[PDB]
C-alpha cells in the first residue's frame, strides 16, 4: 500500500490489472485479533419437556440389513435407480 504512484502505475501497467483494489497483502481491513466473547446457541434437544431420548435415539433406530435373498411372471426388468438426467450446460459461463 505504501508504493509511490510511479511504481504503482508501472506495476498496474505491467500486470495489466488494477492491483491496488485487490492487494494480496493484508492491512486494517481484516478482523481484530481481540474479539468480544460469543454467546453460542444451544441445540434443539436443550428442552425441559418432550425431550425423551427414546424419541431422538438415532443409533437405536439402526436396523440389521434386510436380507432380500437367502439360500437358507412377466415382470419388468429393473435398474438400480432411474437413469441419470443429462446435465444442463451452464447459463453463467459455458465457454460457448
Amino acid at each position: 500500500a505504501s508504493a509511490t504512484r510511479l511504481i504503482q502505475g508501472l506495476r498496474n501497467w505491467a500486470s495489466g490489472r488494477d492491483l491496488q483494489a485487490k492487494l494480496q497483502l493484508r492491512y486494517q481491513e481484516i478482523s481484530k485479533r481481540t474479539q468480544p466473547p460469543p454467546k453460542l446457541p444451544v441445540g434443539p434437544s436443550h428442552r425441559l419437556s418432550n425431550n425423551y431420548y427414546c424419541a431422538r435415539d438415532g443409533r437405536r433406530e439402526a436396523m440389521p440389513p434386510s436380507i432380500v435373498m437367502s439360500s437358507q411372471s412377466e415382470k419388468k426388468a429393473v435398474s438400480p435407480a432411474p437413469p441419470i438426467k443429462r446435465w444442463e450446460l451452464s447459463q453463467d459461463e459455458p465457454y460457448l
Binding site: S2, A3, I7, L10, R11, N12, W13, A14, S15, G16, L19, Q24, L25, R33, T34, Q35, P37, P38, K39, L40, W87, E88, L89, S90, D92, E93, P94, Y95, L96
Partner: protein
C-alpha cells in the same frame, strides 16, 4: 451445471489469423508473462522478519504441552487418565497414588513429544483443564530424549507459560 473448458473453435478470418501469427512471430503471450513477473518485481514482498517478526497465531493454537494449576498453587490434575485414554498416539503415560494429604494426584505424568500428534484431544478431554497444549512452538531440542517430558517439565511449562495460557483459555473457553 457444467462448462466446457477448452472447446473454442478459433476464427479463420484474416484478422484473427494475422493476430495469431503476430502472436507467434512477435511473442505476445511471452511478453505478457514477462509483464506479470515484472509486476511482482515492484510489489512489496510478503516476507516477515523472523525472529524479530512473528507469524500470526490464534488463541486456539496447539503447541507445547503444559500441566496447569488452580489459582492457589494446587495443580489441576486429579489423576483421572482421560487424556491417556483419548490420546491417539498413546503419548501420555500416567501413574498415580494418594499423596500425603489424601489427594488423588499423579506421580508419573509423561508425555512423549515425539509420539504426540499435537491434536489437543488431551486438553479437550481433560475435565479440570489440567493438561493444555499451549502456545509455545519454538522448543526444538538437540537430543531426542529432551522431547520426553516428565511431570516436572510439564509443570514447569505450566509455571513458565501460565500468564499466556490462562489468557488464551479466557479468550477461547466460550467456544468450548
Amino acid at each position: 451445471t457444467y462448462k466446457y473448458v477448452n472447446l473454442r473453435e478459433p476464427s479463420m478470418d484474416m484478422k484473427s489469423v494475422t493476430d495469431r501469427a503476430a502472436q507467434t512471430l512477435l511473442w505476445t503471450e511471452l511478453i505478457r508473462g514477462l509483464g506479470m513477473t515484472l509486476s511482482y518485481l515492484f510489489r512489496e514482498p510478503a516476507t516477515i522478519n523472523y525472529p524479530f517478526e512473528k507469524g500470526p497465531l490464534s488463541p486456539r493454537f496447539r503447541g507445547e504441552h503444559a500441566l496447569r494449576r488452580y489459582p492457589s498453587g494446587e495443580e489441576r490434575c486429579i489423576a483421572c487418565k482421560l487424556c491417556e485414554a483419548v490420546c491417539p498416539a498413546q503419548a501420555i503415560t500416567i501413574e498415580a497414588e494418594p499423596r500425603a494429604d489424601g489427594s488423588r494426584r499423579t506421580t508419573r505424568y509423561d508425555i512423549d513429544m515425539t509420539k504426540c500428534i499435537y491434536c489437543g484431544f488431551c486438553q479437550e478431554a481433560c475435565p479440570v483443564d489440567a493438561i493444555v497444549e499451549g502456545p509455545n512452538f519454538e522448543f526444538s531440542t538437540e537430543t531426542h530424549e529432551e522431547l520426553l517430558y516428565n511431570k516436572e517439565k510439564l509443570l514447569n511449562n505450566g509455571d513458565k507459560w501460565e500468564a499466556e495460557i490462562a489468557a488464551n483459555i479466557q479468550a477461547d473457553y466460550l467456544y468450548r
